[PDB]
């Protein structure tokens, strides 16, 4: 019967499907960290600073 | 986003601004002393004298 097949690839097609998804969603975690740092970093440099006063 | 940009680079300007104007404060102070000196000094020299009487 030609169900049988039909079911059983579905099976497959789902987890692939999953693992496509969670690259992203890993991918995404990554960047979210290098962002904030580079982001908060960059600002901390360009307020800061010394003057002489005499 | 664009507005990320416009914001860091306005903290910029306004610290440049704020060093451009020290400059003149400054300066406006060291000439403020020699200026007056230079004037009382002066003044004192012309009226002063001494006179032989006999």
Do not use: Y
Request: glycine residues 10%; proline residues 0%; aromatic residues 4%.
């Amino acid at each position: 019967a030609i169900g049988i097949g039909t079911l059983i690839i579905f099976i497959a097609m789902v987890l692939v499907a999953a693992v496509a998804a969670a690259v992203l969603i890993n991918t995404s975690g990554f960047l979210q960290q290098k962002a904030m740092a580079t982001g908060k970093e960059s600002t901390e440099q360009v307020a800061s600073g010394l003057q002489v006063i005499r």
